[PDB]
Amino acid sequence: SRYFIEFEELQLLGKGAFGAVIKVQNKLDGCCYAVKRIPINPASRQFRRIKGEVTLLSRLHHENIVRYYNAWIENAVHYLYIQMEYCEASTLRDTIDQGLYRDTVRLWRLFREILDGLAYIHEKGMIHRNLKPVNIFLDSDDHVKIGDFGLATDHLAFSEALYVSPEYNQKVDLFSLGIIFFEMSYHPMVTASERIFVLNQLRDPTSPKFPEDFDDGEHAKQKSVISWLLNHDPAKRPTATELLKSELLPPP
Ligand SMILES: COc1ncc(Cl)cc1S(=O)(=O)Nc1ccc(F)c(C#Cc2cnc(N)nc2)c1F
User: Fold this and answer.
1) Which residues pair with 36 in a beta bridge?
2) What stretch(es) of the chain map to CATH 3.30.200.20?
3) Is the CB–ligand 1 distance for residue 11 below 6 Å?
4) DSSP state of 65
5) Could you give the CA distance from residue 237 to residue 219 in angstroms, rounded to a whole number?
6) Which ligand 1 atom is nearest residue 135's CA?
7) The domain made up of 91-252 is a member of CATH 1.10.443.10
8) Which residue CA neighbors atom 7 of ligand 1 most closely?
9) Where in the chain is the domain with CATH 1.10.510.10?
10) Does domain 1-90 match CATH 3.30.200.20?
C-alpha cells in the first residue's frame, strides 16, 4: 500500500533467508532506494528480535555503512519494509569477480574503508557476524558501504561457512575480513571446486596455506595482513584500529 503508492519497482537485487531486496524509485523525491521486504509473524519472538535489530541498526551513522532511510510494517499476512541507500556500483563480489586484484592502489583503499566501517561498528559495541563480499556494496564514487547485518542475528557484542570463525567476540568480523581480503588480492576463482578448496586451505587449523601463485615477492604485504587476520586464536587477531594504525597498510 505505502510501498506500492510511494515507490515504483525496477529490479530484484537479491533473495535472503525470508525476504527480497528490490531496487525501487520514490515518486516524490525521484531517488532510487533498496527496499528489503520481510514477511513477518507479529508477536512471535522472531519478530520482536527483528524489531530490536531495527532499533539498533537505525542508530549507525558512518560513511562506510549503507545509509538507512525508513522502516515500516504493512497488513492475514504482514510485511516489514526497510528502505536503504541504493549503491550504484553493486557489490564487492562483482568487483572481485571482475579482476579487482590487478588494481593494487584500489584494493588497498577498499580494504582500508572496510576497516573504517568495522572500527565504527566495534566502537558502537556491535558485531556484523555476516561479513562477506555480497554484503559489502560500492557507491557511484567507488566507496565501501557495509550492510546486510541480518535482522534475525544478535549484533550486540556483549550477548557461506567459509567466512565464519572456528567460533562471539568483535574478532569474528576480522577473521571474515582475512578471507575477503584474500579474495580481493587473488584472481577471480571461476569454479566452485577452486573457491571451496583454496579458502578451506586458508582456514586450515595448522596455519593459513596460500596457493602456489600467491607465495610471491609481489604479494608479501597482503600475505602478512591475511595471516594476522586468520589466526585461529581470536586474542591474536588485530582490532580494526590496531590494523589501521599498523605500517603494513600503504599510505592514505
Ligand atoms: C546498515 O544496514 C542496516 N541498517 C539499518 C537497518 Cl534497519 C537494517 C540494515 S540491514 O543490515 O538489514 N541492511 C539492509 C537492509 C535493507 C536493504 F535493502 C539493504 C540493501 C541494499 C543494497 C543492495 N544492493 C545494492 N546495489 N545497493 C543496496 C541492506 F543492506
Assistant:
1) 21, 82
2) 1-90
3) no
4) B
5) 20
6) 30
7) no
8) 54
9) 91-252
10) yes
